[PDB]
């Protein structure tokens, strides 16, 4: 049977007791969800190929398992390997034993290695605990380093390979140098224990960790796709998210409905088929109009007895648009075919037509003693041997050179007088090699001039129309499609680009020859994973694919058999962004979630159709419907009816904004030179960039100092919270700092500075050139500033950003905040206890979230991670050789002598220089946007907290009443009050009432009606009072408007 290696394939490529930070490694890694071959019974275990990687894991009830034997032939013929367990000590033998079909010491031979260590462990992990044991092994050969891993992983589900995780660290090794291909299992069998076999791959893990130096995370690349969030996405505990995976991307889609069906013509045939060509002397010279041959059909034709090409391989057929082609036709001698080469040596090669010392695309020849040679012998051609003007290349000397000097004894007139260069050539159809007339031309090309768009006269989006071979062996290394094109033409031949080097194809007068580039098959990979945590079901998106075309590298299937990797699913769908191999496309249209594209999302509930349905969509698949924000909540036409609120609701959020880097300067020289005479002198010689960069870095340093200061010096002088915390019935209980607890952060803030993932990319971390100068305001100084913040916010008024803090209550502070938002302070003087209950209870439950909601603060953590990646990609770029023999400095200083050392170190520096300048420019972009963030943080604090701004969707949604600041390591949290009326109940009104012939309108109120009477109330609070002349005004007379009615005023 075939069982996935769900979490099997992850291990330690080398010595790393890492902790909780993100790093990648590139070695021979077993694919995830890799199907494993079972061998439980004979029905013992057939021999298998090594495949440059194999996996094993034992699931035994009791101690049975013996060792194995490794080698090419597993026989005395070839150097082999042995693995034996003595239950006392393990040994490894590289020995050559006679191959026994069934095992253990058949014949000891050539035992070059010996080793003793503790035996590889076994049972009572299988029996004593009443569970059993899963003993994973990792077998690898890289540079002969026999990479042996193991541990125990007890499980109780022996049905198949279950979930659950364990690390993998090395055991022993040998410096073999063996070429390992095949292997056997030894044990001293219809029903033997169950195990696995998983074939590995040379891949690139990223490794994340716990705090105890143990593995926790890695992913797959072009297999599992579930646990292929990538081969690098840093976590088993991924969330529901679209994760681009690998560069074997896609094949095409459908398109809009225009269609070519137009072919044109042009008489090129004479250029090669004019059965009466010119003599080799008078090499005929034609260039022709828009008409070509499918030089693939010229390549694969046996009509040409000589298909010789100087410069272009004949397998580069489609993208050939060549600017100028000069056709030069001429007869040949039977033995001159080899002599056809640019810059050759001989009589004719430079004395009848010379191709110069440069490439000549293709020169095409074939014997034609049938169409030319006659029974009397074709009799009409010549050859000029060595008695002429030496023939500069591309010269048709049609001159009759009777003499060269007319007097010299060499040729002249003395001695030889009747000599003449025009020596004629003859032959016969049946003569043999040496004088066989091959039909020979010259095809010389030009370059560097072809701006156009009509190297595409083309159309017909398709799936594909022809066999798998050579659709488009261009878009170099090639792939594509072929079909027919549709346009008219003009005298140019052979060249154009669609736009600016988008070379497409060479058009037909007869053939098919289409690209508009027929695909490089396309770009897109968008594997869906909902997370290993709450799911184990997978699907894959293929952006911009015809789903009938088996998207990835059409039915590549050169990999392990996997329903997703081996694309054959009928559970598919076609979006705008291509096929959805693991889909169950539905039209339910819930809220959007993990997105696919153009309006396709996922993540339904666990009982959509079946009990087997899970929280992840459509167990064993993934359903991706059409996106919607939901449905309508239409609002209607009120002429004067007032759906007036009598109650209201509030909620509280989290607002998260970084306010600095992890303050970092970079001594540019020390970063680069590392206090080295070589680089110190070398950079003193080289430019002044580093000085400017260090200036910029000091600027950003004092910048985050200024950001911290501005976010935490909005008030000139500090205000401690009140001693007794009994604010007009409004409990807070969580945001005031600790009165005497260590670090004096708020209870919320204690829980934050601790709940922040105290690794926080682990970044307690200066290595080289680095530094972390700590900020101006110490963490406790930020805390004290938050104290000032709450002191002003709930203790002084609208005014602690307005200078000195006052000594004023919050009962009446909230009274004046009601008073100044447009609804009188009747609200709390009625309901101070009730609004206090709502407000403080909500604020309390919000901290329950901020305690449970890890990663909901993903922006400060995100920026910590971006600086982490900044320094990390920085150091890995420091680990970029960039033109030397290695990325190290000192070795290649000493490995090579003075000139080589200095030039290689020059390259090393210049490259790492450029990398640092790119880092600092990206860091300055980040620093400008995070300056914007710091100004925005100070601005939220100021506007929303220090007073109360009118800003909308800046601190909450809508009714802005006040606001609250918080703190963090390098960012800040924020929460601010959001007020919303509710309970709409309809009530009639009117812009005017007729009474005593005058028009009556209110000052602050509206003429509300309850069905038969009319009152004046406010428009977020329905308070019934009689309409009189003390709270209203009367003026003029009833104007022209809809709604004049009775019920006069008092």
């Amino acid at each position, epitope marked *: 049977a075939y069982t996935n290696s769900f979490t099997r394939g992850v291990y330690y490529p080398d010595k790393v007791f890492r902790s909780s930070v993100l790093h990648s490694t590139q070695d021979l890694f077993l694919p995830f969800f890799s199907n494993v071959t079972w061998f439980h019974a004979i029905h013992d275990n057939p021999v298998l190929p090594f495949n440059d990687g194999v996996y094993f894991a034992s699931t035994e009830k009791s101690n049975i398992i013996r060792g194995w034997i490794f080698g090419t032939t597993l026989d005395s013929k070839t150097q082999s390997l042995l693995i034996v367990n003595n239950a006392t000590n393990v040994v490894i033998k590289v020995c050559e034993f006679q191959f026994c079909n069934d095992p253990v010491y058949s014949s000891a031979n050539n035992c070059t290695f010996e080793y003793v260590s503790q035996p590889f462990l076994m049972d009572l992990e299988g029996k004593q605990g009443n569970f059993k044991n899963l003993r994973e092994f990792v077998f690898k050969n890289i540079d002969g380093y026999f990479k042996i891993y193991s541990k125990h992983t007890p499980i109780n589900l022996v049905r198949d390979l279950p979930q659950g995780f364990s690390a993998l660290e090395p055991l022993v090794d040998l410096p073999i140098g063996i070429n390992i291909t095949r292997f056997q299992t030894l044990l001293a069998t219809a029903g033997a224990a169950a195990y696995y076999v998983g074939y590995l791959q040379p891949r690139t893990f990223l490794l994340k960790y716990n705090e105890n130096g143990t593995i926790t995370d890695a992913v797959d690349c072009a297999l599992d796709p579930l646990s292929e969030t990538k081969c690098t996405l840093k976590s088993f505990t991924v969330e529901k998210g679209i994760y681009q995976t690998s560069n074997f991307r896609v094949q095409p889609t459908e398109s809009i409905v225009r269609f070519p069906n137009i072919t044109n013509l042009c008489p090129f045939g004479e250029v090669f088929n004019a059965t009466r060509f010119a*003599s080799v*002397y*008078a090499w*005929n010279r034609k260039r022709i109009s828009n008409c070509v041959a499918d030089y693939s059909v010229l390549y694969n034709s046996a009509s040409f007895s000589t298909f010789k090409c100087y410069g272009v391989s004949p397998t580069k057929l489609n993208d050939l648009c060549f600017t100028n082609v000069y056709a030069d036709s001429f007869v040949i001698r039977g033995d001159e075919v080899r002599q056809i080469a640019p810059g050759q040596t001989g009589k004719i090669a430079d004395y009848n037509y010379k191709l110069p010392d440069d490439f000549t695309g293709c020169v095409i020849a074939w014997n034609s003693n049938n169409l030319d040679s006659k029974v009397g012998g074709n*009799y*009409n051609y010549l050859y000029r041997l060595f008695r002429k003007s030496n023939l500069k290349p591309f010269e048709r000397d049609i001159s009759t050179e009777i003499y060269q000097a007319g007097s010299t004894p060499c040729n002249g007139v003395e001695g030889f007088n009747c000599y*003449f260069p*025009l020596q*004629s050539y003859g032959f016969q159809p049946t003569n043999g090699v040496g004088y066989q007339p091959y039909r020979v031309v010259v095809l010389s090309f030009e370059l560097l001039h072809a701006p156009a768009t009509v190297c595409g006269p083309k159309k017909s989006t398709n799936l594909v129309k022809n066999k798998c071979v050579n659709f488009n062996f261009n878009g170099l290394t090639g792939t594509g499609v072929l079909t027919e094109s549709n346009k008219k033409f003009l005298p140019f031949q052979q060249f154009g680009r669609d736009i600016a080097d988008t070379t497409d194809a060479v058009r037909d007068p007869q053939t098919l020859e289409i690209l508009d580039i027929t695909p490089c098959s396309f770009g897109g990979v968008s594997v869906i994973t909902p997370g290993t945590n709450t799911s184990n079901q997978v699907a894959v998106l293929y952006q911009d694919v015809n789903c009938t075309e088996v998207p990835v590298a059409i039915h590549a299937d050169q990999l392990t058999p996997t329903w997703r990797v081996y694309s054959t699913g009928s559970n598919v769908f076609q979006t705008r962004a291509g096929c959805l191999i693991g889909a169950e496309h539905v039209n339910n249209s819930y809220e959007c979630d993990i997105p696919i594209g153009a309006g396709i999302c996922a993540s339904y509930q666990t009982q959509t159709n079946s009990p087997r349905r899970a929280r992840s969509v459509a167990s064993q698949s993934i359903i991706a419907y059409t996106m919607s924000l939901g449905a309508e909540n239409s609002v209607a036409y009120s002429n004067n009816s007032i759906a007036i609120p009598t109650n209201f609701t509030i909620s509280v959020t989290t607002e998260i904004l970084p306010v600095s880097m992890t303050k970092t300067s970079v001594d540019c020289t020390m970063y680069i030179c590392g206090d080295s005479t070589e680089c110190s002198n070398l950079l003193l010689q080289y430019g002044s960039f580093c000085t400017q960069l260090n200036r910029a870095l000091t600027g950003i340093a004092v910048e985050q100092d200024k950001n911290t200061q501005e976010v935490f010096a909005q008030v000139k002088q500090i205000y401690k919270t009140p001693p007794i915390k009994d604010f007009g019935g409004f409990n807070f209980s969580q945001i005031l700092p600790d009165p005497s607890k260590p670090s004096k952060r708020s209870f919320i803030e204690d829980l934050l500075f601790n709940k922040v993932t105290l690794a926080d990319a682990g970044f307690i971390q200066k290595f080289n050139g680095l530094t972390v100068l700590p900020p101006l305001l110490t963490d406790e100084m930020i805390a004290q500033y938050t104290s000032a913040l709450l002191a002003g916010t709930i203790t002084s008024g609208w005014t602690f950003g307005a200078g000195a803090a006052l000594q004023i209550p919050f009962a009446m502070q909230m009274a004046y905040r009601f008073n100044g938002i447009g609804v009188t302070q009747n609200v709390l003087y009625e309901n101070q206890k009730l609004i206090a209950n709502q407000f403080n209870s909500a604020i309390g439950k919000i901290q329950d979230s901020l305690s449970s909601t890890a990663s909901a603060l993903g922006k400060l953590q995100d920026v910590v991670n971006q600086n982490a990646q900044a320094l990390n990609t920085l150091v890995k770029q420091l680990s970029s050789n960039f033109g030397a023999i290695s990325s190290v400095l000192n070795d290649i200083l000493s490995r090579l002598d003075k000139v080589e050392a200095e030039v290689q170190i020059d390259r090393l520096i210049t490259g790492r220089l450029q990398s640092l300048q790119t880092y600092v420019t990206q860091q300055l972009i980040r620093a400008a946007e995070i300056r914007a963030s710091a100004n925005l943080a100070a601005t939220k604090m100021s506007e929303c907290v220090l007073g109360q701004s009118k800003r909308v969707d800046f601190c909450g949604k809508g009714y802005h009443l006040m606001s609250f600041p918080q703190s963090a390591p390098h960012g800040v949290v924020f929460l601010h009050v959001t007020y919303v009326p509710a309970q709409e109940k309809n009530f009639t009104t009117a812009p005017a009432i007729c009474h005593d012939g005058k028009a009556h309108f209110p000052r602050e109120g509206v003429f509300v009606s309850n069905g038969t009477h009319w009152f004046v109330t406010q428009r977020n609070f329905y308070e019934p009072q009689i309409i009189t002349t003390d709270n209203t005004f009367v003026s003029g007379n009833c104007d022209v408007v809809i709604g004049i009615v009775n019920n006069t005023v008092y």
Partner: nanobody, 116 residues
């Protein structure tokens, strides 16, 4: 329309003379160099004579050369080869060979017979 139609050739008894004409009917004749060629039955073809482009130089054969007489006429655009001084060694079909433009130029091939 530059297709060379050869003419003038025909039966000639030994000791006579013949005028030879050849036309690229509807296109140029003048500055194409003329070079006739004799092909003997049972033997190999042999160089006879030719002309220059300018017309001023009637560059005849290597041996005794005054036998053959050549000229160009613009007014009718064909050769005027006044053959003379026969030997029985000229019974052959000849080639117009207007080497200008396309060198080995032909398309009919006119035959002159040097009869007895």
């Amino acid at each position: 329309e530059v297709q060379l139609v050869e003419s003038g050739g025909g039966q000639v008894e030994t000791g006579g003379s013949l005028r030879l004409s050849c036309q690229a009917s509807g296109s140029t004749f003048s500055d194409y160099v003329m070079a006739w060629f004799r092909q003997r039955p049972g033997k190999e073809r042999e160089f006879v004579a030719t002309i220059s482009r300018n017309g001023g130089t009637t560059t005849y054969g290597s041996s005794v050369k005054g036998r053959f007489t050549i000229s160009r006429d613009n007014a009718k655009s064909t050769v005027y080869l006044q053959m003379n001084s026969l030997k029985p060694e000229d019974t052959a079909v000849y080639y117009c060979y207007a080497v200008g433009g396309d060198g080995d130029s032909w398309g009919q091939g006119t035959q002159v017979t040097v009869s007895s």
